[PDB]
Design a protein around this ligand. Structure first.
Ligand SMILES: Nc1ncnc2c1ncn2[C@@H]1O[C@H](C[C@@H](N)CC[C@H](N)C(=O)O)[C@@H](O)[C@H]1O
Ligand SMILES: Cc1ccc(C(=O)c2cc(O)c(O)c([N+](=O)[O-])c2)cc1
Ligand SMILES: [Mg+2]
Length: 213
């Protein structure tokens, strides 16, 4: 699989325990060989900036894929900070674990195998989560708005919870974007960038939760 290819390429070309080289090898391969839906370096640098700004103790990632953004975020996590990541594809999830294992980041991260819509309502229950400091939305684009409503519904957001959504321009999340921008429950900021491994304009939206009406 494409994802085996990427994992193996990292195992051979990256340095173990070094999250940077992991990222850089993942990027080199997808730039030069096989495009992959990693958030990539350009948008990733904006993620980095947002993570460094808010120093979340608990991040929820929707869509882990090969672990590129999990590695990207986890390396910036403070001591004791936890990243939780949801990945419904068991193959992808096994790849993500291997990547995070290789990055020495496996202790900061918990991989949840399942659909976000299924896993979100059990977060407090099974995973000892009160509320989320930060959420990275990067799974199927039709799930951004529904999983936001679900996260809100399940009491997983607090005042100042940061939602950071990838691909709000391409492939695009128009309903989500319309919703957070229009709602008083969310203060939004758009970060214009580029689709990973091409000249297509894409962006990240930061949507900070304000609490209910
Ligand atoms: N509803 C869902 N629940 C959990 N995982 C999902 C869901 N929909 C899509 N996914 C996974 O989300 C991933 C989407 C990727 N763009 C994630 C990339 C990853 N955030 C990265 O930049 O490294 C795929 O690997 C999907 O299998
Ligand atoms: C068939 C197809 C079409 C468009 C893309 C695509 O561009 C893309 C980019 C992402 O950052 C991303 O997160 C996802 N995703 O999870 O669906 C898709 C990728 C594949
Ligand atoms: Mg994406």
């Amino acid at each position: 699989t494409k994802e085996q290819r990427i994992l193996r390429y990292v195992q051979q070309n990256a340095k173990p325990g070094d999250p940077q080289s992991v990222l850089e090898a993942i990027d080199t391969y997808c730039t030069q060989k096989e495009w992959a839906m990693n958030v990539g370096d350009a948008k990733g640098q904006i993620m980095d900036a947002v993570i460094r700004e808010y120093s979340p103790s608990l991040v929820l990632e929707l869509g882990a894929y090969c672990g590129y953004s999990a590695v990207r975020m986890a390396r910036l996590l403070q001591p004791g900070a936890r990243l939780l990541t949801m990945e419904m594809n068991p193959d992808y999830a096994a790849i993500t674990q291997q990547m995070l294992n290789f990055a020495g980041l496996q202790d900061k991260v918990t991989i949840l195998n399942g659909a976000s819509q299924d896993l979100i309502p059990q977060l407090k229950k099974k995973y000892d989560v009160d509320t989320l400091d930060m959420v990275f939305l990067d799974h199927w684009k039709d799930r951004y708005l529904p999983d936001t409503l679900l996260l809100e519904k399940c009491g997983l957001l607090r005042k100042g919870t940061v939602l950071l959504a990838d691909n709000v321009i391409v492939p695009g999340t128009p309903d989500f974007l319309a919703y957070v921008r229009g709602s008083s429950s969310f203060e939004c900021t758009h970060y214009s960038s580029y689709l990973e491994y091409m000249k297509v304009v894409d962006g990240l939206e930061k949507a900070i939760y304000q609490g209910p009406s």
